[PDB]
Amino acid sequence: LKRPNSNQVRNYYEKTLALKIMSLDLSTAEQTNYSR
Amino acid sequence: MREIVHIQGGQCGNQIGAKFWEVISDEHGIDPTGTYHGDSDLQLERINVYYNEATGGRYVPRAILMDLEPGTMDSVRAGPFGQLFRPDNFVFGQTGAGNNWAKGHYTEGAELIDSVLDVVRKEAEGCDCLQGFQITHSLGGGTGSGMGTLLISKVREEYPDRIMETFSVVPSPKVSDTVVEPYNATLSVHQLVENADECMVIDNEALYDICFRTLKLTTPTYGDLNHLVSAAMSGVTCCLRFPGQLNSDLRKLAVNLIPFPRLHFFMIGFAPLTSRGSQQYRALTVPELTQQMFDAKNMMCAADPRHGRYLTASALFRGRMSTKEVDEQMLNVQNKNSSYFVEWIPNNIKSSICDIPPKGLKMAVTFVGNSTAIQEMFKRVAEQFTAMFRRKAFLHWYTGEGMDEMEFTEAESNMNDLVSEYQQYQDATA
Amino acid sequence: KELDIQAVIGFTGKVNEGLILHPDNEHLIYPLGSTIVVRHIISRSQTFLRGHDNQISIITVSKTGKYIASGQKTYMGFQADIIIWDFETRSLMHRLKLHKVLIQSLSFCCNEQYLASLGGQDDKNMMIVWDVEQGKALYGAPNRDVVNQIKFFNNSDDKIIAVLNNGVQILTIDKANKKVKSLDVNFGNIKRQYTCVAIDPSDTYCYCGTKTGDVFEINIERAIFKRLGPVKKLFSLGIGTLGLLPNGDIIVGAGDGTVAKLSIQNMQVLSQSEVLGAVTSISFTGDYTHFFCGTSQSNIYWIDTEKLNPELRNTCHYERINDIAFPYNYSDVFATCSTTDIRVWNARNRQELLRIQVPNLECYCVTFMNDGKSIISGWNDGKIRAFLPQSGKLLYVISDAHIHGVTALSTTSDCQRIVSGGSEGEVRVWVINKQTQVMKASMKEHRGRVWSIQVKKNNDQAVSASADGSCIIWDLKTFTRLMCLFESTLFKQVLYHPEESQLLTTGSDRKITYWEIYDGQAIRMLDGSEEGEVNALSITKEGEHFVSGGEDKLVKLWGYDEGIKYYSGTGHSGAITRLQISPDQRTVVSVGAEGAIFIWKMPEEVV
Amino acid sequence: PQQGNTVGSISKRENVASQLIVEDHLKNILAKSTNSNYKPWKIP
Amino acid sequence: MFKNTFQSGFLSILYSIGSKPLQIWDKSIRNGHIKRITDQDILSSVLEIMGTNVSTNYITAPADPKETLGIKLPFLVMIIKNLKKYYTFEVQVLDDKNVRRRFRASNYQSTTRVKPFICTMPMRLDEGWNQIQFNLSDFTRRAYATNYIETLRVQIHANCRIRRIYFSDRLYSEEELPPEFKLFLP
Numbered sequence A: 001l002k003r004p005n006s007n008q009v010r011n012y013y014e015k016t017l018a019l020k021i022m023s024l025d026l027s028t029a030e031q032t033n034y035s036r
Numbered sequence B: 001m002r003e004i005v006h007i008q009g010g011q012c013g014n015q016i017g018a019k020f021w022e023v024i025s026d027e028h029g030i031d032p033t034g035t036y037h038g039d040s041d042l043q044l045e046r047i048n049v050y051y052n053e054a055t056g057g058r059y060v061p062r063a064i065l066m067d068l069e070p071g072t073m074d075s076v077r078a079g080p081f082g083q084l085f086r087p088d089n090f091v092f093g094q095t096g097a098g099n100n101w102a103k104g105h106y107t108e109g110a111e112l113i114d115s116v117l118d119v120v121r122k123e124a125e126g127c128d129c130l131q132g133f134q135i136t137h138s139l140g141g142g143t144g145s146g147m148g149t150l151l152i153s154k155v156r157e158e159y160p161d162r163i164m165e166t167f168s169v170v171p172s173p174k175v176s177d178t179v180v181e182p183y184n185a186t187l188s189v190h191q192l193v194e195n196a197d198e199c200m201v202i203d204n205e206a207l208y209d210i211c212f213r214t215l216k217l218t219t220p221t222y223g224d225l226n227h228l229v230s231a232a233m234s235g236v237t238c239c240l241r242f243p244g245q246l247n248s249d250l251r252k253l254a255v256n257l258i259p260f261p262r263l264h265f266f267m268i269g270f271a272p273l274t275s276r277g278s279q280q281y282r283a284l285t286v287p288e289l290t291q292q293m294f295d296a297k298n299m300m301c302a303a304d305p306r307h308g309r310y311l312t313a314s315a316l317f318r319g320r321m322s323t324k325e326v327d328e329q330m331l332n333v334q335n336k337n338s339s340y341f342v343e344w345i346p347n348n349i350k351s352s353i354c355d356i357p358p359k360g361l362k363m364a365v366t367f368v369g370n371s372t373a374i375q376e377m378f379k380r381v382a383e384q385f386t387a388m389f390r391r392k393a394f395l396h397w398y399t400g401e402g403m404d405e406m407e408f409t410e411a412e413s414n415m416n417d418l419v420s421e422y423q424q425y426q427d428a429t430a
Numbered sequence C: 001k002e003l004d005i006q007a008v009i010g011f012t013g014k015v016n017e018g019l020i021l022h023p024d025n026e027h028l029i030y031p032l033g034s035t036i037v038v039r040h041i042i043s044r045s046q047t048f049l050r051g052h053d054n055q056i057s058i059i060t061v062s063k064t065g066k067y068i069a070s071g072q073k074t075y076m077g078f079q080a081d082i083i084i085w086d087f088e089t090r091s092l093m094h095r096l097k098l099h100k101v102l103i104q105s106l107s108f109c110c111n112e113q114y115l116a117s118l119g120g121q122d123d124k125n126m127m128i129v130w131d132v133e134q135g136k137a138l139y140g141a142p143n144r145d146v147v148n149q150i151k152f153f154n155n156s157d158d159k160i161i162a163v164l165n166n167g168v169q170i171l172t173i174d175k176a177n178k179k180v181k182s183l184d185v186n187f188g189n190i191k192r193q194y195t196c197v198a199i200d201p202s203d204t205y206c207y208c209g210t211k212t213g214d215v216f217e218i219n220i221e222r223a224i225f226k227r228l229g230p231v232k233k234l235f236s237l238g239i240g241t242l243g244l245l246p247n248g249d250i251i252v253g254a255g256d257g258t259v260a261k262l263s264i265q266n267m268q269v270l271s272q273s274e275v276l277g278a279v280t281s282i283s284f285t286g287d288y289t290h291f292f293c294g295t296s297q298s299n300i301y302w303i304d305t306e307k308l309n310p311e312l313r314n315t316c317h318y319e320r321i322n323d324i325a326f327p328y329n330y331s332d333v334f335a336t337c338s339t340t341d342i343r344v345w346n347a348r349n350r351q352e353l354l355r356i357q358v359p360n361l362e363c364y365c366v367t368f369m370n371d372g373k374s375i376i377s378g379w380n381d382g383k384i385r386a387f388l389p390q391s392g393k394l395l396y397v398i399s400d401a402h403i404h405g406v407t408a409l410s411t412t413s414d415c416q417r418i419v420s421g422g423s424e425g426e427v428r429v430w431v432i433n434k435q436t437q438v439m440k441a442s443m444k445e446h447r448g449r450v451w452s453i454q455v456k457k458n459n460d461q462a463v464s465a466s467a468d469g470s471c472i473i474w475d476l477k478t479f480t481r482l483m484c485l486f487e488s489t490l491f492k493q494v495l496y497h498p499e500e501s502q503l504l505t506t507g508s509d510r511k512i513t514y515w516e517i518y519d520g521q522a523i524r525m526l527d528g529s530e531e532g533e534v535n536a537l538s539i540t541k542e543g544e545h546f547v548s549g550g551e552d553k554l555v556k557l558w559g560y561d562e563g564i565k566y567y568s569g570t571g572h573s574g575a576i577t578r579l580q581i582s583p584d585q586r587t588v589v590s591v592g593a594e595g596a597i598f599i600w601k602m603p604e605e606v607v
Numbered sequence D: 001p002q003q004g005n006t007v008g009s010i011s012k013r014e015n016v017a018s019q020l021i022v023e024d025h026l027k028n029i030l031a032k033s034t035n036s037n038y039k040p041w042k043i044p
Numbered sequence E: 001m002f003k004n005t006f007q008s009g010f011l012s013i014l015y016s017i018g019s020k021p022l023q024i025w026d027k028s029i030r031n032g033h034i035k036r037i038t039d040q041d042i043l044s045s046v047l048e049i050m051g052t053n054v055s056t057n058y059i060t061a062p063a064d065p066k067e068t069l070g071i072k073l074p075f076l077v078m079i080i081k082n083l084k085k086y087y088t089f090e091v092q093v094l095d096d097k098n099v100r101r102r103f104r105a106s107n108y109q110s111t112t113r114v115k116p117f118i119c120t121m122p123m124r125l126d127e128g129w130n131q132i133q134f135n136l137s138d139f140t141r142r143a144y145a146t147n148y149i150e151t152l153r154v155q156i157h158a159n160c161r162i163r164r165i166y167f168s169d170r171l172y173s174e175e176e177l178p179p180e181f182k183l184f185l186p
């Protein structure tokens, strides 16, 4: 079996994990940037 | 309640019904898998008319598909909405009629008719209370024009009281696809006139003219022609399937449209028809609908109505509108066109209303008229027949399978008579 | 100046593949009614992309997280514009002008240099290629039949796929000659209709969906197809979206709303699940687990892989908010009318509280009742309905109140009566009683549809504003004394001043006009954009400031005593229609006709 | 009549695709069916 | 069910030509089978129940127990095809007194006995199709010397093909039977 990138896979891992918890609410902005 | 079964014979009828069922399923909210997903409750109150209920909540059309060759059913089985058709009803032959009415009606058709007769009989006992039967076929093909009308005679023998529709594609010399059209055409129509409660004539050249002129689309196809035919199909029985202020069924039409037992040949039409270039320019109102549905170019038939006088006519509107304005354009169009209506039958216009419009269009109308202009197809077909027949061309193939010259003579004489008494009332005065 | 916004409730699931998780993650992009929004995930920040005029139709992104392409649908007379936005700068990097009405699809190569755009059914299905660095139309292809989507191959960008309505087409593009070659994949006795497509990473095989519900499998090296899809079973509304796992497993979205996976074997589902609304977008996260799903009813779902259990992340409004209301002296909850179903929402946290659904009717002017009694609404058929707060069951219905639908409602404080307005100038009064509901209206005549009815504190006097151009003030005791206020335009919101004598009224003209029952005009404000129709207004308990909003995206609040604007509001899309202020007045809420909900922090120095 | 019904039977059973074809002779069918109208050539 | 409803001359409970011939009927099958086929002797679709252990295979008059099929009508009649196999059918009736009695008719029984709750009777079937008339009036008046008010239930057991079951209310002849009620000869 091929050897995956140890750092890359774990990076995707905790990235998706944190996105899970922080994805609960999308409404709040607190950084408007109407113009840009 | 008051159901009708749907049966196809010959590839033309199979192709018509194949997407007739598609249109019906779409307007009833039925998926290609037989599972209802409509949004309105009225979509489900009257579904037994065309669909039987099967275990698992699915629905199966009460249609019997029949032909003497398997290719067309093999194609339609994989066609869109082909999964709804139950595999049992597929009745197919093994040779093909060779476009020969003899092989289509005496040698092969007579022996093959037993299975389809059994199936249609069982289907007839299946429904609660029968309204009648309706056919979709072409007189120009051997297997259809022969064994379909054979089945017509058998079924009319066994159910004398029911009403029958026959939507028939007649041959025309403008678009002629076969060299032997007059023979089997006259042979089929001779038998069909004696048993047909109602006959709906459809002209493919007229279909090309319509799809060329009314819509301005570059390359129409058999699918588009089938779409127009299917719209005409659904317009007739919309009122029986949905509520309305003035409900009128097939027996209503039979009572109101046929003065005499031999005058049951009709020409039909559908409106509105608009281009994609002008649909949102054009403002659809009741006068616009009526002027379109009385237009000479909107008719599904090549015979021009202004060469004769209407014996009677009927119109079915679909969508929400009051009835008095409908009545007023009816009376106005009867008044300004009194020359084109027979004068000894006043009030020869039937009007019916249904409050459920078709999907995507808020108003629609279907027109069916018994007119004294139909004699043109019959005279030209008879002229072609005698042109072929005086030299006995293409005759040995028929006479080699039970045919003789006497049957052709009787059919020709009967058609000439039918023309004579059909045009006699045009000149009749009160 | 500009006013803060704290929360936004907006999403459009009408456009397919609208929801996109930006590669490298942390960024989630989706289209609003007419503007694109990007959101950082770990932080709570977001950014707006507003370089458009009409509703967005298509959103696409490149590989390796490079620039984004957005396309919108316009009127027949004009031409749709394709806008390329450079990422990491949030700047419009290019604008391109071609095609007649709308663009159906956009495709990016594996390399970022090239572009493909597909026009709508109008322009006769024109396929165009573009160059990213400089906008150039190298060559194009017109075809008769409609093509639903086009996709570039993962490698060998010279070969592209097009799911034409009749069947599949493979197109070859060469640099040597500007010509494009077309090969039609032939099917034996098959007339399936095809919408979505996906390509395996090896570029050997492509899986294409069907309107019937079975996914076909076709090699690119030949016009031969292999497999119809799930045997003996279908998905009952066609195939919405396709996705490919590294295993080759095919994640499929059904039209009814259904998520299932088929192994690269006999097409049998390993696991199946049910999801609300028609599926519209599927986005696979990095490492291909726990992907995002976007419905056609504006719902965002977090769907696990290999064990399909749907978990609802958040829900959004379906479309076209009609009006908003607060309870009397209560601000924790607020209710919104919808196209079909009324919703209630919490102000602090904007998760959905409760929905009351009606199949095929529009609501207008939902009115709350103190003492926690039923909520009242009016519908298209002309009926009025009252529903209980915790659970959506109706207390009562009033049938055939007005011929063409009730438009506006107002409640007296002591709540024994309701005043209602129809489209054809009819204003009616109904005596509610726990036993029965009766009416004693004057059946007073009033030409246009009435958009607003207000009742003063002492509850005897009640004003009603018509579309015709008259704001008539009714004594409500004798149903007489018809003195009505005159100006010539389409009226809108009218308000009493709290514990004064003045009427703050608006109309189609770009003017907020202070009036009195004696034709007394303090000032003619004239708050005008180029083609703005100021429509929504609100007043503080103390007459320091009033909030005003037009049809234009901008919304602004003005000092009552003196005609000078303080602060302003932007970031909206489309026509803003209603502006309310909470009883606690710590915020101002606005509802946009394109599905967006905005709550704004009112400035501190208006207390 | 007796036959002509059998041969028709195979066709409709064939119309079901299911990623399979029924020619009527697939599995556990005698030793083997003659490779042509005559028995096979020496080199296939 | 069938209470406070008109009846004058006839009342049909079951007939095999319809979309759902048996809706009020409840079917319980253990080793048998139920289906309707066109009959060779009479060219029409006929419902059929078949199986072994005739006791366990039956169809009940109500879909569920605990309520009545209240019928005031005196005369039962059935159209059954004689298949040269076992067959039983029973009827539950209410008398003058609020008592429930029952009459069973068996093909394979040879003795008749009266009992307070059950009255069994043998029956004989001629070859081929036949329609049989069940009086029930003289039957109750002879078995318990008590008149009848209402007939609660009807039950058919296995091994039979059935065309019509109805209430005829009096002895009628073929000529005065309407076309649907009469059996047209092959």
Ligand SMILES: Nc1nc2c(ncn2[C@@H]2O[C@H](COP(=O)(O)OP(=O)(O)O)[C@@H](O)[C@H]2O)c(=O)[nH]1
Residues within 6 Å of the ligand: B009, B010, B011, B012, B015, B016, B097, B099, B138, B140, B141, B142, B143, B144, B145, B169, B176, B177, B178, B204, B222, B225, B226
């Ligand atoms: N409207 C319509 N007409 C058709 C179609 N197929 C064939 N026809 C017409 O039918 C005629 C030939 O009929 P034919 O195929 O011989 O009928 P068959 O013998 O029953 O198969 C041609 O002139 C066609 O115009 C179809 O799909 N739609």
